Write an enzyme that holds these catalytic residues in place. Sequence first.
Site, short mmCIF file in Angstrom:
data_model
loop_
_atom_site.label_atom_id
_atom_site.label_comp_id
_atom_site.label_asym_id
_atom_site.label_seq_id
_atom_site.Cartn_x
_atom_site.Cartn_y
_atom_site.Cartn_z
N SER A 247 0.84 -1.20 0.00
CA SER A 247 0.00 0.00 0.00
C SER A 247 0.88 1.26 0.00
CB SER A 247 -0.95 0.02 1.17
OG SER A 247 -0.31 -0.19 2.39
N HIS A 277 -1.83 -8.81 1.79
CA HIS A 277 -1.42 -7.60 2.50
C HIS A 277 -2.41 -7.21 3.58
CE1 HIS A 277 0.33 -3.88 3.46
NE2 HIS A 277 -0.16 -3.12 2.51
N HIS A 321 7.54 -12.93 11.17
CA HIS A 321 8.13 -11.79 10.47
C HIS A 321 9.49 -12.24 9.90
CE1 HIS A 321 8.83 -7.48 9.51
NE2 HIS A 321 7.53 -7.37 9.72
N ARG A 330 3.61 -3.30 18.17
CA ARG A 330 2.24 -2.87 17.92
C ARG A 330 1.25 -3.87 18.45
NH1 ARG A 330 2.23 -2.16 11.63
NH2 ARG A 330 3.19 -4.25 11.98
N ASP A 378 -1.74 -8.16 13.63
CA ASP A 378 -2.97 -8.75 13.09
C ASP A 378 -3.59 -9.89 13.94
OD1 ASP A 378 -2.97 -7.06 10.45
OD2 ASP A 378 -1.08 -8.14 10.28
#
Lengths: 434, 434
Positions: A247, A277, A321, A330, A378
């Site tokens: 994005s 994504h 990751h 986060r 997420d």
Amino acid sequence: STAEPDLKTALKAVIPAKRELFKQVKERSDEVIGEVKVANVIGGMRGLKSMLWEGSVLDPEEGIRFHGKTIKDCQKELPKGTSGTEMLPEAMFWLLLTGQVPSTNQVRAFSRELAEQSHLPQHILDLIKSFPRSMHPMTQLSIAVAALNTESKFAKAYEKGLSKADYWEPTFDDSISLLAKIPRVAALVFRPDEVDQVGTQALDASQDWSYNFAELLGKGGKENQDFHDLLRLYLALHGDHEGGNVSAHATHLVGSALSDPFLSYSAGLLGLAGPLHGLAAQEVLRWILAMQDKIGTKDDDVRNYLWDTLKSGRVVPGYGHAVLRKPDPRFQALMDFAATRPDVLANPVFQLVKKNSEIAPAVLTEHGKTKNPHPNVDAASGVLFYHYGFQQPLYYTVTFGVSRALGPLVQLIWDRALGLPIERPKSINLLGLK
Amino acid sequence: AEPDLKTALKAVIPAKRELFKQVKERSDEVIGEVKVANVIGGMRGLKSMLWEGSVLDPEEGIRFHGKTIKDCQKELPKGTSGTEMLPEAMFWLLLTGQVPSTNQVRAFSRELAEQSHLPQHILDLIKSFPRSMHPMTQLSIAVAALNTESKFAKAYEKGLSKADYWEPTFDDSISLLAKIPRVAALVFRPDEVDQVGTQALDASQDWSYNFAELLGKGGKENQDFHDLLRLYLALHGDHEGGNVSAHATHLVGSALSDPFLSYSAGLLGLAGPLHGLAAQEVLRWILAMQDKIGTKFTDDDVRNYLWDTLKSGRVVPGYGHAVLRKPDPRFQALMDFAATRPDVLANPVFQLVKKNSEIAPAVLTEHGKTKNPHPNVDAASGVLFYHYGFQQPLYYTVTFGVSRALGPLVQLIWDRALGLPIERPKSINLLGLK
């Protein structure tokens, strides 16, 4: 008593320093900083240090940082809302753009501009009423955002004759305009039956951006203040994560041809609508609900289901990751938010997320298929929205869309201030790599 | 008996997968250097993406699986009446690597005619656009909105193996291809949405012919325009991956957004003044030149105007390339088309294009500022459309949009067949470059 500068003026003050820095980097133009390998060409440019992105850098130990500040530093230093404990997205935007932490008064003046500039032309309301119910919410969002190019100061200014040194001023104007309007657009995607009322409802100009977004979603008032703090936090955390994600990159790419911010961020939303994504949060929620369903409501319990999942070839969503060696800060910030709300802690669905986060990393490490198998943001985000009554996963990415305007719009303003050229890599075919 | 397009693609897939696997064995091989210049110059010169259909030869220009424009003019099927090569044939070549038979192209043309109708919601969407909306914005939006009809979006949601991602991608690509001419015609003809939007097509005519019919230029009296349109659409289909419309399509598509959302992103880049305005720029400049020097000019009159242009700081549009050392063979293909139409040859405006192509290169070489100053395709294309009565230059990018679906859709089908990963470069900030 003394005068405090607005966002545009604060940006103007730090522009010369960046231009001086840019000029020094240009003196090192011939310096080699790496190798292009065949692996990079066929692996979608992985590890190819090939674009510029000022606002955020990923530290492999601490996670994402914003001009050198961690998530924890941002939570402590950035201005809060008139009610609530969480940092404001407008404050994050200010930090991303200027490199500096705004005062509270500076953020309130910025919030007010964002409320005053949030109205949509009639043609956008007509456009949204034309969408069928079957249309994906992310498609609705991308389209409506592109359609706001009718209001672009940059498009008009570039056509008329405009100095290259001043391309940033109209880009800034359109970026703030986009920012002001996008929460409303998102709310119309959530509430297709209420387009005429939500589309023109006046906002409380003394409240923050997230509060007003919640109001247009139907969740305003003091009775929904917990949700307001979630929304603020969520929006601030997802604003920026380097330039390599699709994005951000798509926005930069399209914007480098001098398409205005509305067309550019539209392209970013189209990338964000991609399953690899932006639909990760939706996928996690689905998988957590499927898990709860199979085990009902029964530490060791979870482990069997995880192993069963991995031995059948499926992936555990929300884990892993390529570079980060610890849990996503986060993610941690979302759990710290949960820790002080006793009702979220008591939701079975969050309990299931939490247990899985304490057990899956060990399990995924022993299995060995995925490197750095720690929860990412997420894992948590879907469940939190589900708790506050957003139970249709299809719309989760819309919220990410609103948030993800922050970072790429910041880079766009800087791309134009620095005078960066069009993105033009060179392609090669497989036969040409032999 | 002869295969259909899907079956022809299926036959060549395994060979490409075997080739991909050999290139993978060579992954560690170095093929270049990353310099600071590459990072701050939007990746210029950085051989970092894969693109199968087209490779730019520096002597011969763009080539399609090894074939020059002249080889394509000779070998590719034409229409049932007409001298120029068909875009459907070009698509077939780009996708399969093979030249289709005439019967194969006719069956492909018919599929494209049968699939050209639009849902009512797209017609409602287009009626919502204000008259002021840029035509490229209208086109990008309408194309995105067709994601309601995406087989890939639906299939991926339901459960679909990675080995089969290409089949629904192909289906959507053909569907997009079938529909986009109609969409473009609705952008050209906003007063006639209801009739043009549902008008039945002649299922026995080629893609370009049916585009012309929906634009209001159908019938025998416009046969010459039909040939121009065919040629124009075929020539602009593909020009490597590095250009913004191709790249954006690949980028967004790599996140597994379907072809409708992906090509929408490509159109958003194409709507950028640094990408899609070249034909318009040339036409304006040619008309301004005709205004100054008239219709009865000599070689010295042309030479003098060019010198006057360059000595005042202005650039001659449509001339020059960074790599290509001869005139663009696509430009030459437009002049070969002109050569057999006596009426085009007699238009003063085309005479001026032709004269300028014989004189300006010498002049630009002596001046020394412009590298490889030979005509490119944008020199000729605008004047040709203007001759046949397309005198609204703002719409020429829409036509480029239709054509430029061909190549990027081909690459998308291959991206999915090969299983190529998401595009994810690595960003760095300026301080990180010191």
